[PDB]
Amino acid sequence: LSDKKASDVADLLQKQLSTYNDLHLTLKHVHWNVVGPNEIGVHEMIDPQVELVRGYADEVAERIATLGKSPKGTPGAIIKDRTWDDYSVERDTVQAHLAALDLVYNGVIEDTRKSIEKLEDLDLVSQDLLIAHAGELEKFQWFVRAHLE
Amino acid sequence: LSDKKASDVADLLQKQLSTYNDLHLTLKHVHWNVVGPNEIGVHEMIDPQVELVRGYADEVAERIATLGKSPKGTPGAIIKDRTWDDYSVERDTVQAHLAALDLVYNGVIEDTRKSIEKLEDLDLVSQDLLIAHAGELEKFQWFVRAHLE
Amino acid sequence: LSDKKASDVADLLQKQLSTYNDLHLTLKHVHWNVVGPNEIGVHEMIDPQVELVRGYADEVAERIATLGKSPKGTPGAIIKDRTWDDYSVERDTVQAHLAALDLVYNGVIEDTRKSIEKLEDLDLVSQDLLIAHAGELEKFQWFVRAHLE
Amino acid sequence: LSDKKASDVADLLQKQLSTYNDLHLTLKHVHWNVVGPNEIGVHEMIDPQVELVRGYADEVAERIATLGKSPKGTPGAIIKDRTWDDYSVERDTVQAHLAALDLVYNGVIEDTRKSIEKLEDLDLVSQDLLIAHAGELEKFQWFVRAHLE
Amino acid sequence: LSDKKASDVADLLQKQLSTYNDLHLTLKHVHWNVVGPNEIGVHEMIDPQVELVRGYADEVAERIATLGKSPKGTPGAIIKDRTWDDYSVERDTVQAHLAALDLVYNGVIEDTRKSIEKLEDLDLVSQDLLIAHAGELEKFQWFVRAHLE
Amino acid sequence: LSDKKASDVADLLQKQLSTYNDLHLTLKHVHWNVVGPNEIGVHEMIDPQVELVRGYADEVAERIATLGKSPKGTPGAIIKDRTWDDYSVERDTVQAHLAALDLVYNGVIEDTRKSIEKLEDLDLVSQDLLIAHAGELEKFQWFVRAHLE
Ligand SMILES: [Fe+2]
Ligand SMILES: [Fe+2]
Ligand SMILES: [Fe+2]
Ligand SMILES: [Fe+2]
Ligand SMILES: [Fe+2]
Ligand SMILES: [Fe+2]
């Protein structure tokens, strides 16, 4: 297809790839701190989301490689493309971490919604890929919110 | 046990935790670029090592939490504690990536050997944990080298 | 091997053997008092630890016999080698007993850490045996603490 | 039932609880020293008796808790309530240990027969519990004697 | 890692490799002479130890190859690195051969304990490998001694 | 049978026993150095031959014991009876090691052919035993040669 847009598209995806790696490192981080006896509801809530996100990265990576470029998911590439602030907690409790996760998902969902809009004129294939992820990410966020409450 | 050393130990482990997250992001990165038809030997070589490393992080994370501290595997924490340079390739080929991986393992094995020496007087439990990892990491490196050749 | 050290080693192990018998009598004691309907989490938490500790004694006993001496796990030998105070509770509740258990494990882990240090120059085999136990004992203590909280 | 006798009964049982813990530590002690190639008959003879005795303690402990008191099977409580002398051997052989075991069972059976007589007017339930144990303990002693011979 | 020590380590392992090949040729030798009807206890005692030792060599060989050197288990290399005297018997009986085996294990355990001490500053990985072997070798020796008796 | 020849026969077999132990130590040696990714054909070629040779030794050992003598497969006995030179390689490659193996088999097959001729007048039983081995040894050599090529 188009040699420029392919670069434009690849750079959007490449950012989304880093959004995911960032998220599933963060997911694995919240998982490690929230592992307690009354917190069993949550430690299990995170598990499938970790696997699901890692899967999303794999889809995006494979999509980048299909477009001709090479995927980057090295830690340098994550901080560089990363938009929002690192996962800080005010306190070490279940609800703090949930609240904090809730905001990371606000971050992820928002940047995704952005890449989707940017792709409207560039590549509707890669768009539909990201639209799919968003439904589920937005879905998981609901599950975190409903716990807070 | 001892309140200072526990901080000294935790900070050593915390670094090792980041060594691992860095490695298995890197492993997943080399995996994504080396996925080709004549490269099938390698794409499968990486697979078990990814899982194995993620497991190592989980052990270290759980060990940190046992000592009373909280594990950090957020992307910020990776670059901060990271010693060597980001995974750069000169070229996009199987042997370049192998060679590059080989050096990352030199990096990982060396910092691990260091944490092990530093722990000799601090915490022989956490040491034996890391000694175990090293045998296998050093083992996998051999497998990468033997391919180069 | 060396005829003196073997006596030095045997006497260290023999103490560890008594640490274990003391612990799994204590574990079985806390188990018997904490057996209540809202306390089901805990009565089941203790079960595997009892079996695991009895196993540790069996390893140590068998190690003593391998070194040429005879193991002693008679009740006299337990009080004699025992370092810390008998398991007293302030009150008969779940959290009192947990708190009390937590401190017994502080006791056990500390004496073990000691035998490990003393064995650094004497017998690295018997050391590695005890290093292994410590990781798990320290692990179980975490599980008790996380309940208190 | 009666508030005094319940204290009288509990204190009898509590002693029996300690008789058992003492016995199955002793059983596990004789087991550890008698583990040899021509001694295979015996190392296997002990095994089921250990499990059986630990079971007896569990019955007695649970009976104490049913009467309202709390069971004590801590090592201090064993030496305190213990009547006869600690398990000493003249020599380290199969028949010495058997002979020594034989006498410990004389000790156990005699104190049990006592608690049974004392309970004749106090609590026929707890009595029947102990009468049952005695038949089997007396049975196992026979098996030890028949080996000596 | 370090280019000298790697040579120092390799030469220690290489000696241990030869200790093992020497042992499991010796084990297979004692096995062949002790194969009699009343000697069935022993002919079966040796069997698992042969397999276990051959396994030890394979671990050490593979460890040497991991360090970059090439393993040598040719018969020349065995006599050269061998410390103690060849397996001579005074008489052809079960107990002579056991006694003789007992001393070979004294030899093996002692040289292993040595390589372990020498490795304390050189390579704690390869050390832990040898510490593991020693526990079991020392264990098997016990089984031989307990037969003599 | 005949008291001298039995000594003559035993000493021929005893040499063949050492030929085998020498070979399957050598086989296990070539196996350890040739374990590489493109070398998978070979690492698997060696495996069954190792087992097969160890089996040959067991047959010969058992045959010696049947004739009244005692088998010797100690490392001293191997170098003493050994005819040809120790397994040296010019280089560490697959084809060098094959070539080197090829020559060891020339050595083994030749000494076997000799023991067979020497046994023509001494013991046709033990001969037929060795004739059998030769067919297969000569067979395996073919497989090594066909690889070189
Ligand atoms: Fe769709
Ligand atoms: Fe050490
Ligand atoms: Fe270990
Ligand atoms: Fe009655
Ligand atoms: Fe260790
Ligand atoms: Fe024939």
mmCIF file of N, CA and C in Angstrom, chain B residues 12 15-16 19-20 23 83-85 101-118 130 133-135 137-138 141 145, chain E residues 1-3 125:
data_model
loop_
_atom_site.group_PDB
_atom_site.id
_atom_site.type_symbol
_atom_site.label_atom_id
_atom_site.label_comp_id
_atom_site.label_asym_id
_atom_site.label_seq_id
_atom_site.Cartn_x
_atom_site.Cartn_y
_atom_site.Cartn_z
ATOM 1 N N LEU B 12 18.509 -5.331 46.207
ATOM 2 C CA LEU B 12 19.222 -6.201 45.284
ATOM 3 C C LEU B 12 18.217 -6.989 44.446
ATOM 4 N N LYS B 15 16.299 -5.217 41.920
ATOM 5 C CA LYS B 15 17.044 -4.961 40.741
ATOM 6 C C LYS B 15 16.980 -6.159 39.889
ATOM 7 N N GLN B 16 17.029 -7.329 40.502
ATOM 8 C CA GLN B 16 16.954 -8.604 39.763
ATOM 9 C C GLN B 16 15.582 -8.811 39.116
ATOM 10 N N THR B 19 15.830 -6.831 36.081
ATOM 11 C CA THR B 19 16.641 -7.564 35.122
ATOM 12 C C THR B 19 15.801 -8.573 34.349
ATOM 13 N N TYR B 20 14.860 -9.207 35.058
ATOM 14 C CA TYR B 20 14.055 -10.249 34.445
ATOM 15 C C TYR B 20 12.997 -9.659 33.550
ATOM 16 N N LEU B 23 14.544 -8.628 30.529
ATOM 17 C CA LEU B 23 14.915 -9.755 29.687
ATOM 18 C C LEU B 23 13.697 -10.356 28.929
ATOM 19 N N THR B 83 21.217 -1.799 33.860
ATOM 20 C CA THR B 83 22.634 -1.517 33.785
ATOM 21 C C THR B 83 23.107 -1.288 32.354
ATOM 22 N N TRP B 84 22.834 -2.219 31.453
ATOM 23 C CA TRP B 84 23.478 -2.221 30.132
ATOM 24 C C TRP B 84 22.579 -1.463 29.122
ATOM 25 N N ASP B 85 23.024 -1.407 27.868
ATOM 26 C CA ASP B 85 22.303 -0.672 26.818
ATOM 27 C C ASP B 85 21.080 -1.406 26.250
ATOM 28 N N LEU B 101 21.202 -10.944 21.402
ATOM 29 C CA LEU B 101 20.716 -11.708 22.561
ATOM 30 C C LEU B 101 21.870 -12.260 23.407
ATOM 31 N N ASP B 102 22.887 -12.802 22.742
ATOM 32 C CA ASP B 102 24.008 -13.406 23.434
ATOM 33 C C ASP B 102 24.593 -12.405 24.400
ATOM 34 N N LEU B 103 24.709 -11.150 23.947
ATOM 35 C CA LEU B 103 25.298 -10.077 24.768
ATOM 36 C C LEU B 103 24.392 -9.614 25.904
ATOM 37 N N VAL B 104 23.088 -9.560 25.654
ATOM 38 C CA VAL B 104 22.129 -9.280 26.720
ATOM 39 C C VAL B 104 22.256 -10.315 27.828
ATOM 40 N N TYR B 105 22.463 -11.584 27.457
ATOM 41 C CA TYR B 105 22.646 -12.631 28.463
ATOM 42 C C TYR B 105 23.954 -12.505 29.209
ATOM 43 N N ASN B 106 25.004 -12.100 28.496
ATOM 44 C CA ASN B 106 26.249 -11.677 29.176
ATOM 45 C C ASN B 106 25.942 -10.626 30.224
ATOM 46 N N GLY B 107 25.136 -9.641 29.846
ATOM 47 C CA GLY B 107 24.686 -8.618 30.787
ATOM 48 C C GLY B 107 23.913 -9.184 31.961
ATOM 49 N N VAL B 108 22.928 -10.029 31.670
ATOM 50 C CA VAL B 108 22.074 -10.548 32.725
ATOM 51 C C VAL B 108 22.874 -11.450 33.650
ATOM 52 N N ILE B 109 23.654 -12.356 33.066
ATOM 53 C CA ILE B 109 24.393 -13.320 33.867
ATOM 54 C C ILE B 109 25.374 -12.593 34.774
ATOM 55 N N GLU B 110 25.998 -11.516 34.267
ATOM 56 C CA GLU B 110 27.003 -10.771 35.025
ATOM 57 C C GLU B 110 26.367 -10.054 36.229
ATOM 58 N N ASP B 111 25.274 -9.324 36.019
ATOM 59 C CA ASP B 111 24.593 -8.664 37.137
ATOM 60 C C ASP B 111 24.056 -9.665 38.176
ATOM 61 N N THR B 112 23.627 -10.832 37.706
ATOM 62 C CA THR B 112 23.151 -11.860 38.601
ATOM 63 C C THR B 112 24.292 -12.378 39.444
ATOM 64 N N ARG B 113 25.381 -12.763 38.772
ATOM 65 C CA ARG B 113 26.604 -13.169 39.474
ATOM 66 C C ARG B 113 26.979 -12.104 40.527
ATOM 67 N N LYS B 114 26.785 -10.825 40.207
ATOM 68 C CA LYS B 114 27.044 -9.758 41.161
ATOM 69 C C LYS B 114 26.091 -9.820 42.357
ATOM 70 N N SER B 115 24.776 -9.804 42.110
ATOM 71 C CA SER B 115 23.817 -9.859 43.210
ATOM 72 C C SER B 115 24.106 -11.073 44.085
ATOM 73 N N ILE B 116 24.530 -12.183 43.473
ATOM 74 C CA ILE B 116 24.857 -13.396 44.232
ATOM 75 C C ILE B 116 26.024 -13.144 45.174
ATOM 76 N N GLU B 117 27.045 -12.430 44.698
ATOM 77 C CA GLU B 117 28.225 -12.172 45.527
ATOM 78 C C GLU B 117 27.881 -11.214 46.646
ATOM 79 N N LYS B 118 27.098 -10.195 46.322
ATOM 80 C CA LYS B 118 26.663 -9.224 47.299
ATOM 81 C C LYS B 118 25.798 -9.837 48.395
ATOM 82 N N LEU B 130 18.934 -17.156 43.533
ATOM 83 C CA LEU B 130 19.558 -16.568 42.345
ATOM 84 C C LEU B 130 20.594 -17.501 41.716
ATOM 85 N N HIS B 133 18.652 -19.712 39.289
ATOM 86 C CA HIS B 133 18.389 -18.991 38.028
ATOM 87 C C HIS B 133 19.625 -18.912 37.108
ATOM 88 N N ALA B 134 20.772 -18.707 37.703
ATOM 89 C CA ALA B 134 21.965 -18.470 36.920
ATOM 90 C C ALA B 134 22.337 -19.678 36.118
ATOM 91 N N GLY B 135 22.292 -20.857 36.754
ATOM 92 C CA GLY B 135 22.590 -22.122 36.064
ATOM 93 C C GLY B 135 21.815 -22.272 34.770
ATOM 94 N N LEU B 137 19.904 -19.705 33.134
ATOM 95 C CA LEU B 137 20.251 -18.556 32.245
ATOM 96 C C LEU B 137 21.570 -18.793 31.480
ATOM 97 N N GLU B 138 22.579 -19.252 32.212
ATOM 98 C CA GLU B 138 23.892 -19.559 31.628
ATOM 99 C C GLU B 138 23.719 -20.684 30.658
ATOM 100 N N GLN B 141 22.091 -19.394 27.426
ATOM 101 C CA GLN B 141 23.040 -18.603 26.637
ATOM 102 C C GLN B 141 23.840 -19.537 25.742
ATOM 103 N N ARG B 145 24.561 -19.280 21.725
ATOM 104 C CA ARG B 145 25.904 -19.308 21.155
ATOM 105 C C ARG B 145 26.057 -20.436 20.154
ATOM 106 N N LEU E 1 31.945 -14.967 31.671
ATOM 107 C CA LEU E 1 32.541 -14.553 32.986
ATOM 108 C C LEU E 1 34.062 -14.462 32.889
ATOM 109 N N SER E 2 34.756 -14.736 33.976
ATOM 110 C CA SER E 2 36.192 -14.613 33.977
ATOM 111 C C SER E 2 36.946 -15.772 33.294
ATOM 112 N N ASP E 3 37.750 -15.344 32.357
ATOM 113 C CA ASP E 3 38.489 -16.212 31.463
ATOM 114 C C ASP E 3 39.488 -17.160 32.161
ATOM 115 N N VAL E 125 27.616 -21.336 41.342
ATOM 116 C CA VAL E 125 26.706 -22.181 40.549
ATOM 117 C C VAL E 125 27.234 -23.606 40.539
#
